[PDB]
Amino acid sequence: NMVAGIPGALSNQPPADASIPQDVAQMKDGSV
Amino acid sequence: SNQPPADASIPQDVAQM
Amino acid sequence: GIPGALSNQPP
Amino acid sequence: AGIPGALSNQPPADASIPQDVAQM
Amino acid sequence: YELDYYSKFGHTDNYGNLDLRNKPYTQLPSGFVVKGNLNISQTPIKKLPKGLDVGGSLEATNSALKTIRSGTKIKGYANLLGSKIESWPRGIKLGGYLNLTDTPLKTLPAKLRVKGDLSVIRTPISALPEGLVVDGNLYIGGSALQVFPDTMTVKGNIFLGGNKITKWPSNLTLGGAVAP
Amino acid sequence: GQSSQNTELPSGLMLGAGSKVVATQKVHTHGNAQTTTNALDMMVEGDGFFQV
Amino acid sequence: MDRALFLAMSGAKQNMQALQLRANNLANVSTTGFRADLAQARSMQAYGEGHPSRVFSMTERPGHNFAQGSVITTGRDLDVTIEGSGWISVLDHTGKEGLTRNGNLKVDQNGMLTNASGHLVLGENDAPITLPIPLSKIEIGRDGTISVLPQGAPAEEFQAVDRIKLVKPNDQSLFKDTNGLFRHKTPNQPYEADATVSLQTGAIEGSNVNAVGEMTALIDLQRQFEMQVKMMSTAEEMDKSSDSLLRM
Amino acid sequence: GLGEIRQSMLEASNVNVTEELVNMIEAQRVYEMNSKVISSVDKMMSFVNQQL
Amino acid sequence: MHPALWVSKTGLDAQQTNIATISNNLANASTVGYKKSRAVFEDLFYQNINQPG
């Protein structure tokens, strides 16, 4: 499986701060 | 360990996890 | 394929 | 053991004794 | 001395949790009500007041607590680690686990119900009460227990931790596994 | 731009954009009378507007 | 590098957002019927495996200041202010009803009673108030009753035509919407008129923003902001020094 | 319901000079307060790109 | 911006109405069948921060 996402400032935030797009946050689990 | 560690939870309300 | 990625070609 | 008042990083559950800390 | 109403206010957080860590208080007023969690760790308190009510969890780790009187209501868990409690009173309404590790506890109430986990680790307790019901994990490691009662109920895992059990309960239904 | 739900949590935090002047309202309160000796100046007591 | 760089950045970012909320308060000091916005920070810990050392903080609005605003006596008949607690029920451009405290009312060319924001004023039948076009003297009552004199009628023909819908719900159950109107947190909650709300006609209620209260909060957000940005630089400094463990 | 015409009388302005001066005081202090916020934001950002 | 700023402005407005009534009485000191007038003062509503009783 492939794991991915936005690095840096946006990801190093609590989930309440919805900077990360919803579908990109899904990729951070697993994909194939 | 033989399994990946779980992620970190940062909830705005611990009652809803 | 990252859903909704920007492209690099004039719209 | 060591320090007597160390914290626990696990979320509160009130039903399971936290084993993260050195509970002895 | 003893805690007053004004001294109580200076040890309470926004959501109503009383923090008495290292504070020199000896006794609390009867009919005491706490909005949230209660912390009496490292306190010279030897007795909890009758009619004590805690809206959260009771924290008495490494304290001098020795006696808890019946009728106390605790919504959360009870953590009496390293305290001087020798016996557990009957009729305590506990909404969480009971951690009695490294305490001089010797006796337990008959048919005690623990809605969470139970700990008797490294305690001089000689035998568990009959009809014990545990909804979580039971840790008896390093204790003096060697014989279980005729009937007991554990809904999680049972951890022997090193002590040798010779007489197992006749009626036992286990939701988990047994670990030495 | 999703809104409402939990407005007392970090998720539902709402930020303003400042202030503005929406209207300059005319206060048509009847004024005091000046008594003059000129015979060609006139006044309306109560509601009314002269027409030119 | 170290995660304390983003842990402090996530704190400095919220301080700017808190600063924006205080900026909106001071910009609205002269606004009519404005309820001040409170700013607070919530401590949220990253629960998981490891030592409990990282705790994020986010700024959020816990509520609003519902204290009585400054009353401006203007002598104008169509100026109303709520005495004590209470609200005026109005419907916005879309049509959804909501509560307002701006009593800078006016009468259009057709008699419909609006406020300074353009919201239509609800009446006794939960409908916008429509007064007769040829008026002579509008005299609002203390309880909200609107008594108007028809044009050309004698002064003794004073009759009531409507009663402004005044609602006094629990202030803690209200949230400010995207246009300054307070509505119920629970959807589909009827706004029931109250018989205790009073209207002081001839006066306008101003803002309740405490200017010094915002200023003294500003000088503390700046200092907290500057402390965290120093942490970002010192975390950068630590990583640069540790870059000499792969030189070999 | 129309008003009456009064000859040799004039309707003075309905301005309240004292009321305008009081409004001038409030508008002046609010004007200065917002400038304080602008200076505070500028000084905060100036600290970032200088220190960091 | 300050409650005392607007509370005292109501006092200023109240006196202006009061003086205007006094000036009207002195102006009509020779009018036949004129009945003098006096302004009636009253306090505005009180903010109920703490309930008495």
Side-chain angles (χ1 to χ4, degrees), chain G residues 135-152:
Chain G
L135 300 168
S136 180
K137 173 60 187 304
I138 310 177
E139 226 286 335
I140 318 292
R142 183 148 306 273
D143 55 351
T145 307
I146 301 181
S147 59
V148 298
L149 182 55
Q151 187 178 8

Side-chain angles (χ1 to χ4, degrees), chain E residues 1-178:
Chain E
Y1 63 107
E2 41 272 1
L3 184 75
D4 294 68
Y5 171 62
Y6 314 97
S7 296
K8 174 216 301 181
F9 133 92
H11 299 296
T12 301
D13 60 356
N14 292 303
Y15 297 158
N17 305 279
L18 187 60
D19 158 71
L20 303 179
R21 208 179 305 103
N22 283 263
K23 304 308 174 184
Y25 300 117
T26 59
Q27 59 182 12
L28 298 182
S30 63
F32 200 66
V33 174
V34 182
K35 186 174 186 177
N37 303 271
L38 177 53
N39 196 323
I40 51 178
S41 302
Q42 300 171 308
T43 53
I45 287 184
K46 286 186 174 182
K47 191 175 305 176
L48 281 180
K50 188 177 182 179
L52 175 68
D53 190 6
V54 177
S57 304
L58 175 63
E59 197 80 357
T61 52
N62 303 269
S63 62
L65 181 61
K66 176 187 179 181
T67 303
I68 298 183
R69 299 189 173 186
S70 59
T72 304
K73 296 184 176 183
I74 301 179
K75 175 184 172 183
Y77 57 82
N79 191 4
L80 310 179
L81 201 169
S83 56
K84 297 299 180 178
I85 169 183
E86 300 186 19
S87 61
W88 184 258
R90 173 195 171 184
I92 293 295
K93 299 184 180 182
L94 207 62
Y97 62 76
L98 182 56
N99 185 10
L100 302 173
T101 305
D102 293 320
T103 55
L105 171 85
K106 299 176 180 180
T107 62
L108 290 177
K111 303 179 182 180
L112 176 60
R113 265 197 52 89
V114 180
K115 300 181 182 180
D117 304 5
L118 184 64
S119 293
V120 293
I121 288 183
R122 276 161 278 183
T123 50
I125 177 186
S126 57
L128 281 177
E130 193 70 44
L132 183 66
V133 179
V134 182
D135 295 359
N137 302 14
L138 178 56
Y139 298 78
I140 67 175
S143 62
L145 302 176
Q146 289 211 3
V147 167
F148 282 168
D150 291 324
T151 303
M152 77 181 305
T153 300
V154 179
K155 295 185 178 181
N157 295 268
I158 296 181
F159 299 90
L160 300 184
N163 76 113
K164 314 300 173 58
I165 289 296
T166 59
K167 184 176 182 178
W168 288 79
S170 302
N171 174 32
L172 174 59
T173 302
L174 185 67
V178 182

Side-chain angles (χ1 to χ4, degrees), chain G residues 45-117:
Chain G
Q45 179 183 328
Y47 302 99
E49 185 70 33
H51 301 268
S53 62
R54 298 171 183 175
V55 176
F56 289 83
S57 72
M58 295 194 67
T59 50
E60 34 124 9
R61 187 170 61 178
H64 310 264
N65 191 21
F66 298 105
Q68 171 70 30
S70 62
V71 278
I72 336 281
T73 46
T74 56
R76 183 175 170 270
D77 53 333
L78 290 169
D79 287 355
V80 294
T81 170
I82 292 89
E83 299 180 2
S85 181
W87 295 89
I88 297 180
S89 293
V90 296
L91 55 92
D92 59 351
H93 195 2
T94 64
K96 177 178 293 298
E97 299 184 3
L99 305 180
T100 192
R101 209 159 163 90
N102 174 17
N104 194 330
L105 304 183
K106 77 190 69 175
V107 182
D108 70 328
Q109 73 286 352
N110 300 330
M112 305 177 183
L113 193 64
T114 87
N115 69 325
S117 301

Side-chain angles (χ1 to χ4, degrees), chain C:
Chain C
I2 40 162
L6 294 194
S7 58
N8 47 5
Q9 168 243 0

Side-chain angles (χ1 to χ4, degrees), chain F residues 1-51:
Chain F
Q2 302 190 15
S3 176
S4 180
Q5 200 61 216
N6 303 119
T7 54
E8 276 59 35
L9 292 186
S11 175
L13 174 60
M14 305 173 61
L15 294 178
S19 61
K20 73 168 187 176
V21 177
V22 49
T24 64
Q25 187 175 1
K26 278 278 189 176
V27 182
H28 281 273
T29 292
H30 201 303
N32 283 260
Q34 307 175 186
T35 296
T36 66
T37 185
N38 195 18
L40 283 172
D41 67 79
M42 307 163 194
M43 186 190 179
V44 174
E45 49 166 39
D47 295 69
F49 292 92
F50 292 105
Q51 308 166 30

Side-chain angles (χ1 to χ4, degrees), chain G residues 190-221:
Chain G
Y191 299 90
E192 295 157 344
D194 196 324
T196 322
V197 186
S198 301
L199 292 182
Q200 206 286 270
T201 172
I204 270 188
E205 173 184 352
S207 175
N208 55 4
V209 171
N210 187 20
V212 183
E214 315 291 342
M215 293 302 301
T216 188
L218 250 67
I219 72 159
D220 200 16
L221 292 179

Side-chain angles (χ1 to χ4, degrees), chain G residues 169-181:
Chain G
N170 194 24
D171 294 328
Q172 308 294 334
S173 62
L174 303 167
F175 79 100
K176 188 183 303 180
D177 205 354
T178 67
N179 50 94
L181 292 191

